[PDB]
Swiss-Prot record:
Mutagenesis or variant effect for D139N: Impaired nuclear focus formation, reduced interaction with PIAS and increased sensitivity to cisplatin
The family this protein is said to belong to: Belongs to the DNA repair metallo-beta-lactamase (DRMBL) family.
Localization annotation: Nucleus
Tissue: Expressed in brain, heart, kidney, liver, pancreas, placenta and skeletal muscle.
Protein known as: DNA cross-link repair 1A protein
Full-protein interval shown: 700 to 1040 of 1040
Organism, scientific name: Homo sapiens (Human)
Protein's job: May be required for DNA interstrand cross-link repair. Also required for checkpoint mediated cell cycle arrest in early prophase in response to mitotic spindle poisons. Possesses beta-lactamase activity, catalyzing the hydrolysis of penicillin G and nitrocefin. Exhibits no activity towards other beta-lactam antibiotic classes including cephalosporins (cefotaxime) and carbapenems (imipenem).
Lineage: Eukaryota, Metazoa, Chordata, Craniata, Vertebrata
Induction per the UniProt record: During mitosis. The mRNA encoding this protein contains an internal ribosome entry site (IRES) in its 5'-UTR. This 5'-UTR generally suppresses translation while specifically promoting expression during mitosis, when cap-dependent translation may be impaired.
Subunit structure as annotated in this protein's UniProt entry: Binds constitutively to TP53BP1. Binds CDC27, which is itself a component of the anaphase promoting complex (APC). Binds PIAS1.
Length: 341
């Protein structure tokens, strides 16, 4: 049955609550983004209204076959009215089409649901600047101080320089990038752009990326693996057996793979700067784990909350153990004491 932290009080709304059947007294189902832990349970047989971004709606229609009459896409940064409640969708800086949702309840309470997000100081200049928030439903994925990571831009610089150098030294090398859900597209697109190649992939992955409004996508992606020197594969195939196998299938077109696994965090970041990262190598296969995160680091999260100064924080991640919950509540107290609210 539905957890309390997926329910918006004083409304008939839920957020990312599609694996519970018919939720008692839910009139409208919001979806923050197209990742499987959040959409789990949608299908062509779903007949309640779903509210979401334009991109997420494209994906519901095309990938899950949800019927068009039940998809209610909203533009960003725009006051809209749902079942008599004013709502706004804000960019979450997560994956394509991911949003945070602002709710303005009839009694004057204001609620922000972050969905999944990576906090950034650019958010301190949206419709959030203009008013107070009583309740924050917060993405606490990395809510512990050991989670530090570089900026996405520093990680992309590292990957582009690495791939450029490798292929210049060996023009018969193949670059591989692992993927398991939408998100992290800049990794593979930036690499392809510096090598003057398209990114090759399965027809199903190509179809998924065409659902996204990426300007000049016919331009960056293809299903012709032959013409391409950057290939996308399932994250699971990013290991030595998977990559030897793939290398065989290219029919002596390539003699080496350099592969990137853009993971969230790895305990190497406690003892290593981005500049000092190295691969795992076996034969003519090298694998780099790079800390490209689409969630807030601990310090990014803390700054965002100390700026917003919500009256109450409800964590939405890591809530299933008493020790995790207590640890997060202790941080939230420090933040409030340090910030003076
Ligand atoms: Ni997500």
């Amino acid at each position: 049955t539905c957890p309390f932290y997926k329910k918006i009080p004083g409304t008939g709304f839920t957020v990312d609550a599609f694996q519970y059947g018919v939720v008692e007294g839910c009139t409208a189902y919001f979806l923050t983004h197209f990742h499987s832990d959040h959409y789990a349970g949608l299908s062509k047989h779903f007949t309640f209204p779903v509210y979401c971004s334009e991109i997420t709606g494209n994906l519901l229609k095309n990938k899950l076959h949800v019927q068009e009459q039940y998809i209610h896409p909203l533009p960003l940064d725009t006051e809209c009215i749902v079942n008599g409640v004013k709502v706004v969708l804000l960019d979450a800086n997560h994956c394509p089409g991911a949003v945070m949702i602002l709710f303005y309840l009839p009694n004057g309470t204001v609620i922000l649901h972050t969905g999944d997000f990576r906090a950034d100081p650019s958010m301190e200049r949206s419709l959030l600047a203009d008013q107070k928030v009583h309740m924050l439903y917060l993405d606490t994925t990395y809510c512990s101080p050991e989670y530090t990571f570089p900026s996405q831009q520093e990680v992309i610089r590292f990957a582009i320089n690495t791939a450029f150098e490798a292929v210049t030294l060996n023009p018969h090398a193949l670059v591989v990038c692992g993927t398991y859900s939408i998100g992290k597209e800049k990794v593979f697109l930036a690499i392809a752009d510096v090598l003057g190649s398209k990114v090759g992939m399965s027809q199903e992955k190509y179809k998924t990326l065409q659902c996204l409004n990426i300007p000049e996508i016919n331009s960056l992606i293809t299903t012709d693996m032959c013409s391409s020197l950057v290939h996308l594969l399932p994250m699971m195939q990013i290991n030595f057996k998977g990559l030897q196998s793939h290398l065989k299938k290219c029919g002596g077109k390539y003699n080496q793979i350099l592969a990137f696994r853009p993971t969230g965090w790895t305990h190497s970041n406690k003892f290593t700067r981005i500049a000092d990262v190295i691969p795992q190598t076996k034969g003519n296969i090298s694998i780099y784990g790079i800390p490209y995160s689409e969630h807030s680091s601990y310090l990014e999260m803390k700054r965002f909350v100390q700026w917003l100064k919500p009256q109450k924080i409800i964590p939405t991640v890591n809530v299933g153990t008493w020790k995790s919950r207590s640890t997060m509540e202790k941080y939230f107290r420090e933040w409030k004491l340090e910030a003076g609210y």
